């Protein structure tokens with residue numbers, strides 16, 4: 249294969265997208281009670297990831313382009329349990345700005361969330377185009393959590409991600425938490441659940457982890473601070489290549505920020521062809537920078 253060519257929403261420029269960014273950012277600030285005062289930031293990051301992470305480099309199916317999460321087949325993927333709360337948050341935004349494509353809106357939600365939680369700037373490109381219901385990918389393309397480093401590595405090859413990209417992207421588990429009813433895992437990865445930092449790598453290295461079984465009969469790694477790691481998270485310190493990179497990001501916040509920003513942009517852009525006459529990527533100002 250498919251070719252997906254980016255097409256700018258008719259007549260729109262930087263100023264129109266910054267308005268949508270601001271609407272999202274303001275609502276994140278306002279609807280702050282969700283999930284015991286974590287807010288909607290983490291679920292929006294997860295949503296941008298799950299809508300992008302269906303991509304397959306072999307035939308160019310899936311990915312962020314088509315916005316196919318709106319269709320029932322993908323919406324009801326058991327892997328997507330809990331993301332309805334992100335979709336509902338974005339629905340009134342989409343009504344206020346009905347000219348934005350679904351894929352642009354889901355991806356921009358992730359960018360906005362990261363920046364407003366004090367993460368790196370993520371350059372973002374517009375032009376995703378809604379595609380028909382029969383372009384929805386089948387369930388099963390998102391990863392399982394009960395596997396090891398070899399599975400993680402192999403899985404991310406399908407998205408054209410290398411070891412450094414994978415380790416960088418996984419740092420997003422600083423954000424939010426697992427929810428028993430959604431995934432069969434329970435607890436947060438850290439203390440500051442709605443601030444983007446390199447805390448995931450710090451906790452992985454410095455906590456004393458014990459293999460326990462949770463109320464859904466799944467194994468997870470638990471620490472005495474009250475944190476948890478999935479088996480896929482913990483595997484990053486079992487594999488010697490991953491461990492070297494985990495140590496790097498634990499000791500250099502700025503490098504983690506830069507590498508995350510590139511890998512996350514790539515994730516969101518996988519499968520899309522941008523014409524040479526396409527506008528350059530936008531960098532949005534945060535509310536804080538606008539004095540808002």
Ligand code: HEM
Pocket residue numbers: 290291293294297329330391392393400417418420421423424425426427428430431432433478480512
């Ligand atoms: C091996 C790859 C991954 C696995 C197996 C995995 C698995 C999971 C699971 C099971 C949850 C809990 C869902 C719930 O109970 O609500 C979760 C949450 C989350 N994931 Fe991952 N994930 C992976 C990679 C990623 C990536 C690559 C990103 C973003 C770049 C990401 C961002 C998040 C965030 C922000 C949450 C918190 C959501 C919330 O608080 O509602 N994850 N992940």
